[PDB]
Structure formats: C-alpha cells, structure tokens
Amino acid sequence: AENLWVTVYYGVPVWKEAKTTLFCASDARAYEKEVHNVWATHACVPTDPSPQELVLGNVTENFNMWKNDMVDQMHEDIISLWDQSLKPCVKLTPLCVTLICSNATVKNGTVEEMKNCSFNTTTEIRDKEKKEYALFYKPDIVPLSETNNTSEYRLINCNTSACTQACPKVTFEPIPIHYCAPAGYAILKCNDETFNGTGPCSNVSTVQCTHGIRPVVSTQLLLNGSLAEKEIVIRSENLTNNAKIIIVHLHTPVEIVCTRPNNNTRKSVRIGPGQTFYATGDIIGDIKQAHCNISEEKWNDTLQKVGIELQKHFPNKTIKYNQSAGGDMEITTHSFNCGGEFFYCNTSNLFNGTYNGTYITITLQCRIKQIINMWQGVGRCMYAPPIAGNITCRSNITGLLLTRDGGTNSNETETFRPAGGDMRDNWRSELYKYKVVKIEPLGVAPTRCKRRVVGRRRRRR
C-alpha cells in the first residue's frame, strides 16, 4: 500500500466490442471501373494503398465468425446497391403478350431446349403494332391454361411481379472491395489459420482495412475464394447439431472451366419510345448445350482429404457424399454468375462416392436462365440480356458448403449433401478473420504523483 492521487492520463489505446457501419474502398485503379458497376459502388475510391499492418505484442482477444455483424452489414449494402443500380433502367412490362411458340429451327438441325416465340409488340406510335420474334433461351415459359391450344405461352414475370432488365451501360463484376474502418475504430485481424470459428486468437494484428474481398455469388460451391494456407478447415455452429451448416475451405484450388458453345446473336427490339429490349435473335452455329469440365485426378483427392478431415471430428464413421437435397431450382443446382449470364448445373458427379478416408474429366450438363430473382429469393426480378458469341469462364473452386443428414441412420454411417444457403454464408466464409472495436481513451488511473498546487508548474513528481 502507498499514498496515491488520481491522474487524468489519457490518449491511451483500449478497445471494446461494438457495431458500426463501415467505409468501403476498392482496390487499385478499379474505381474507374466502379464508376459503372453493380456489386461495386459509385464509388469506393481508395484514399490510401491499404492494408498496412503490425503484429500486436502478447495480445489475445476473443473472436466470433457467426455473431459477426460485418456480414450482416454487407448483405444490406449489396442488396441496396443491386436494387438502386437496377432501379433507373428500362422496365420490361409491355412484353407480357400472348406468345405463339414453336420448335426453334436452327442451321442444319434443331436446338434442344429453347422455343422460337413470336408476339405482337408496340411500334413507335402507340396506335399500331407489328409482329416480332425472339428466341428465349430457357424452356421456362409457362403454358397458359384455360385452353386446348398447346402453344399459347406466357412470360413468367407477369405471373407474380413486374421486372426490369439490367442496363448494358452497367456490368456485373466481382471487383475486390476492401472494408476500411471509420475514424476512431480499429479492425482487428486473426492470423492463426487453425482458428475453427470461435475461441481465443493469440496472434492478433490490426489493419487500416480488410484484405481483398470480392462479392462473387455461388451456391453449393465457392468461386475465387481464399484458401487456408496449411490444411483443409472445417467450420460450423455446432457439428453435433443436425441443422446449421458446415463450411469447408480447400487446401489447393481446382480449376473449373465453364463455357457456352452455342453461338448466340444479340438482337434489338423497339418496345417503346426509347425503351430498347435485347433478346437472342438467331443461333449461327452448331449446338452442344452449355457444359463445364473439372479434372477428376485432383477433385477425387480433394474429397478424400476433406473426408479424413471430417472423420477426425466423426471418429470411425465412414463418410458418404450423396445427391443434392432437393427443393428450389437455385439450390438443387450449382448456381454461379459469369459474364452477365447465369448458369445452372445438375452436379452430375460432384457428389457421388463413399470415401473412408483410409484408402481401403468430369462433365456437368448445365441449363441456362434469363429471368432470375436475386439469390436472396424474394426480391426484385431481373432480366439479363444475352451476350454475343461464345462465353468462357475460368475460375478456382476454393470451398464447399455442406449440411448433414440424420438422425437415426445406423451409427457407423454418415451422409453429407451439397446444399447452398443464405447469401451471407458465401461472404462469411471469406470474412471470418475480422472484428470491429471502438477505441476508448479511458478515464483515471492511479499514480504516485501529487496535486497541482494552485496550478503551479513542477518537474518530476
């Protein structure tokens, strides 16, 4: 014990848990692209070459990837950006007309999926109309009931909600986005890659801004993600819980090549006074239907590694991967955007096979859709115009999304199904490292110093 006096002392670093909306910063020159994009703002211009870093000395702090509010913030950010960038574009409403449709004859053959549909449309003067034809490259057009005529189809937007097309002036792009804290907050970061979702981390580092995050969307598979450096990681709310989810990160990527062999032709249609409508006019080449290719020699080994990783948590239980679960078309099929188009794939052989984890070219047939909801699944309908010529995608698979079966199978067997989920999960797989804490320069701490005495100046005391 010793004689002491209060000492206002401050300017100190001490932090606490908090929540607050963040500031966005896009990487490199991409802001000049960001002038016109969706999934990128207008515009997250970077004021500094982020991220600068230090390793904090002997600091350990709690983390949590599930309670993390940054994913919750960026979900609202992306959905608002999507809606507002789509808002001023041309609406599609007057096309909902009785479509007469037939087999889509093409050069030296007949195409497999689509239907050649012709309909009445409004010319420039509203008092007259003309016959026009377009090739909707999806069989998804509902045949109108109440009629024995088996050809009077309807566009399915008008069944439930009017829609809007994406202006070609703006483009879908997964531009990387860095989140930067506002003034007075620090974004802590954990560097221990063994972090399995929740618990202490003892190599905490601070940064001005988060690392490269790109908002790319996919279901049943992650595209262009970031890999755990050492081993394949498993993360979950609670594995023994039948519900919730299991997120997996691969140790090395596996190349996915996806392409659209049909040579489409972009066509214009004059629906209104300045409103121009884009549709696939005519196919000018051979037909093979869209498909994707994955090398089996890497991917089988990838399943075997993830299988032994699963068996670590599930002792002596053999792992079965089996068919996709069911339900809607957006999660029974691998969805992923590419080049303004949308691909849907059946997962032909991305599920099958039993692999004990002890060691005792794949083709995907893919459909294509023009009219989509946001993968949110209730929001605004969108029309994506066709892209001329072939489209080719090259991307790196990095993580899988799984859910568990149960709960009265024979105790020695267990089954996992590839099934997507809420869009927050895709970003949460990449945003597991960060927190947001407010710096609080605190109040009073004791010292052996003494009073100020009429405001008198003194030296050391």
Partner: protein, 121 residues
C-alpha cells in the same frame, strides 16, 4: 398473434399417397425454419425433414427419405408435406411446428392442431 394453422383429417388405405397442409397466419415472413414432427401414440415420436422456405431447402431425415417429398409456396405463407405409399404402420398425428426463435430452432414452441391421419388395413 403468431400461430400455425393446420388441416385436416382424412382417412386413407394402404399403398396410396397423402398430403397435409400447414400455414403461417398473423405473421410476416416464414424465413425461420418450419418443421414437421410425427406423434405416433404408443411409440417414441419421430422427427421428419424440415423446411426452410427462403432457399426452399430440405433435409429428409429418417429412413422416410425413400417416400417423403416436401415443398412450399412463399407467396401464400404455406407449406406442404406429401407421402408416397403409406404403410399400415404410418398411422399417427402429424404436427407442424416452428422453433422458439430463429437461432436454436429445435426448441419447438409453436405447434399445430395435430391433423390426424389413420390408415386402416
């Protein structure tokens, strides 16, 4: 005013299919994981595959996966269960339940009226 509406009683015979409704009423959006449970008298109750109507996902749980097929309709706040090839054993009361709150859904708070379905040999 959040509760679940269920209907309705109906007799059946072996080999045929079957359908049961469930609806959320007085309630905004059914984002949170609705469920089904079977309260068979005289035997331990069984839990069947849930439904999560936002994504439309599903998880056929027990050896019922060989018969069960489940759907929903987000634009009417309604969910449907369908069974194929009802055996005599499957006589029970089917309950449409929801979690206490959307974090730990397995604590079934809200329960339906218990639509009975007896199948006679």
């Amino acid at each position: 005013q959040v509760q679940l509406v269920q209907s309705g009683g109906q007799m059946k015979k072996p080999g045929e299919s079957m359908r049961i409704s469930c609806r959320a009423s007085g309630y905004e959006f059914i984002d949170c994981t609705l469920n089904w449970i079977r309260l068979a008298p005289g035997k331990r109750p069984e839990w069947m595959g849930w439904l999560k109507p936002r994504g439309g996902a599903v998880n056929y749980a027990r050896p019922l996966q060989g018969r069960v097929t489940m759907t929903r309709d987000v634009y009417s706040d309604t969910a449907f269960l369908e069974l194929r090839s009802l055996t005599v054993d499957d006589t029970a009361v089917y309950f449409c339940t929801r979690g206490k709150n959307c974090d730990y859904n397995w604590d079934f708070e809200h329960w339906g009226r218990g639509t009975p379905v007896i199948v006679s040999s």
